[PDB]
Amino acid sequence: SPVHEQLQVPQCLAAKITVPHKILAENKEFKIIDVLSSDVETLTILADKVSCGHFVNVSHKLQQQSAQKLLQGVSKLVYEIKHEEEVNAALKEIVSDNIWQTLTHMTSYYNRSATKDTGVETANWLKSKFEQMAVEYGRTDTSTFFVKTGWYKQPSLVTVIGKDIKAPAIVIGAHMDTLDGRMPGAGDDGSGSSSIMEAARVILSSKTTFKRPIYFIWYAAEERGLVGSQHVVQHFQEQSIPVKAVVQFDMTGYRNDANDPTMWVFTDYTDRDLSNYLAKLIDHYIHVPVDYSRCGYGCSDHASWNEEDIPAAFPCETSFADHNPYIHTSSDKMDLLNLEHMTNFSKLAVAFAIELASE
Amino acid sequence: VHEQLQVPQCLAAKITVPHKILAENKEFKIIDVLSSDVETLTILADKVSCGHFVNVSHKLQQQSAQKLLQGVSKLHKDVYEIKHEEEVNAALKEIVSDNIWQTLTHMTSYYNRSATKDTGVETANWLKSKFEQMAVEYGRTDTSTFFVKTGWYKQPSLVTVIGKDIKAPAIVIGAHMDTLDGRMPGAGDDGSGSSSIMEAARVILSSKTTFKRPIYFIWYAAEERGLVGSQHVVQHFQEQSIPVKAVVQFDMTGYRNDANDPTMWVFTDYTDRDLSNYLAKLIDHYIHVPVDYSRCGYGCSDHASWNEEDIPAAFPCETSFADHNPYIHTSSDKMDLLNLEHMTNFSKLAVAFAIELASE
Ligand SMILES: [Zn+2]
Ligand SMILES: [Zn+2]
Ligand SMILES: [Zn+2]
Ligand SMILES: [Zn+2]
């Protein structure tokens, strides 16, 4: 009565199978096995206990040749919210006015182009500000350095809190640059640069010892094609600095409708689980709506990480369809932005840092 | 100086500054251009609105460039959206919790619903009669039912359709009808889902709307044998060229880890990312409970069968994987351990998914 059936089984489950079976084909992630129908339910019970996946009945699709051919992806069974008190206390320390002041200063450069002296001055000033902040709060485990940009004279600025911690890092970024000409660059990406500077200040003023280093990075030459972030990613590979997760803040201040506080999670060139985690952090800690959008190839600095398979996510001020119409112009000015919106992005950065760096 | 840029085809087609093609493939060109022209390309890219470019100069020339190429996201494509509030909210108001509980009472009274048993067969026959009686009761005339065979397994899959003549990629809502052998009431798995989608089918059958797409309600056979029925159904649709736009799977809609916490879970493994995000929005907008995310592994449930053929498929579920019902696959998987409000919420989700997607 009992028939032969063929099952595609993940290796993690296949290794524990003890009913009689023949292996028909195999690869790194799967075996295809032949077993009796009367023993299949035994494999269900086993799968339940092992908790690394179940199996797919492939009898219909078939033998060793077919089976091998059939084989030419098994998911591991994390990002959670486990630090409410610490996050909520840190969110209470964010000072909106600090964001506004940083943005005032950044937007007063004629531009912040990676080919210009003003571009260079921007990088120097961000570096100093972070350094002064580390001294102000007595934070002793910090370090700063430039990562060069080839023929572009503006370097990327890399900063770290927990310089000696040997674990995959958590990275928070923005880009410091603009196009040439008169470019205040308030929204893109003065706003993100300023939002993450205030989040850095909050981490710097805490006395927590995290389980992972935390980087704050301001990339050079994003406008030129992600130049600075490509140099940073390469710098990390060449110094074997592992990275667990990256968030990008690029445009944190323009609201399509002042009364709608929705934050947008970008779904192209980003890590799916990390993106979902941002959606949760927004809902749990920021208490505003979340919606989804795509911004295209080469959209911002997260893409540089995503290309090297490092988990990276991108929350943004608007959808792509409704983006700030003044970006890349002399009209990209701070009065058109919303400080609450900028503050909310800063809160997100802080919550991402504290949750992920504490595990 | 010159610079090399990796450009999507859509943008590359519009470039009129001087440039040399160094390499190209189906989705991209790498071009060489003067540095003085790069900002021109930024402006162009902003206007063309199909993506920007990556500066690859650091990584390079034609050999490196071709080697570098060995894709491009679409930005003006249709998006899953919420555009049918009034119709959805009225249909949600028609869902009757009690009908769900009654269906579940009947399904759980079979000794089991194993695909190798007569009780498995009787389950499929009863579901088919129930859908058919419901279609006649409301005078819905554009419906049709059929069994899809399951090879050696005697339980067929039940495929049902509302809008049988409509020539457009369909919307599919599923659950599995089966259990293990022995005494398996299978309340949670997957009596609950089977019942939640039966009540959603009733609501669509009782409406008078003419949708722009056929709507399928499917109860798969032999899910517990490794997705056997779903595979037969997917193959049936491929061999008959019945196109499918989007699929949702309801597997376990009734157990709450904490009775007071009504969170619904979107499964991120073996599912379509955009459709999964859309479910999160449907949950938040129409159901008004929290959403959280979890993975359940290879061969989890019938959505995987669709996902393998690149048909967009999504899987909302009653708990996380870690916090899943502890009575599953046992005789204790009983109705009394379930929560009817949770089952009703899943039924609402099915109704909202059908009406939103089938109306576009
Ligand atoms: Zn930007
Ligand atoms: Zn920009
Ligand atoms: Zn199930
Ligand atoms: Zn099951």
Residue numbers in the entry:
A (entry chain A): 3 to 64, 72 to 81, 89 to 93, 97 to 378
B (entry chain B): 5 to 64, 72 to 81, 89 to 378
From the paper:
LapA is a protease-activated, broad-spectrum aminopeptidase. LapA is annotated as a leucine aminopeptidase, and the Merops database assigns LapA as a member of the M28 family of peptidases (subfamily E). Given the enzymatic activity of LapA, which was revealed by structural analysis, we posited that LapA promotes L. pneumophila growth in A. castellanii by cleaving aminopeptides to release amino acids for uptake by the parasite. Thus, we infer that ProA cleaves and activates LapA.
To confirm the activities of LapA, we purified recombinant LapA-His6-tagged protein containing 378 amino acids of the mature lapA product (minus the 23-residue signal sequence). The structure of LapA contains two molecules in the asymmetrical unit, and all residues could be built except for the N-terminal His tags and residues within the interdomain linkers (residues 82 to 101) that connect the PA domain (residues 1 to 81) and aminopeptidase domains (residues 102 to 378). The PA domain is formed of four helices and three β-strands, and the aminopeptidase domain has nine helices and seven β-strands. Although LapA was purified as a monomer, in our structure, the PA domain of one chain was associated with the aminopeptidase domain of an adjacent chain, which formed a domain-swapped dimer. The domain-swapped monomers were essentially identical, with a root mean square deviation (RMSD) over Cα atoms of 0.083 Å (without linkers), although variations were seen within the interdomain sequence. In our structure of LapA, the PA domain covers the active site and substrate-binding pocket and thus represents the proenzyme form of LapA. The structure of LapA is similar to those of several known aminopeptidases. For example, the positions of active-site residues in LapA and LapB structures are almost identical, while there is a significant reorganization of helices between PA domains. This accommodates differences in their substrate-binding pockets, with LapB’s cavity being wider and more negatively charged, compatible with a preference for positively charged lysine and arginine. The effect of the PA domain is likely due to a transient association between the PA and peptidase domains in LapA, as we observed a monomeric and domain-swapped form in solution.
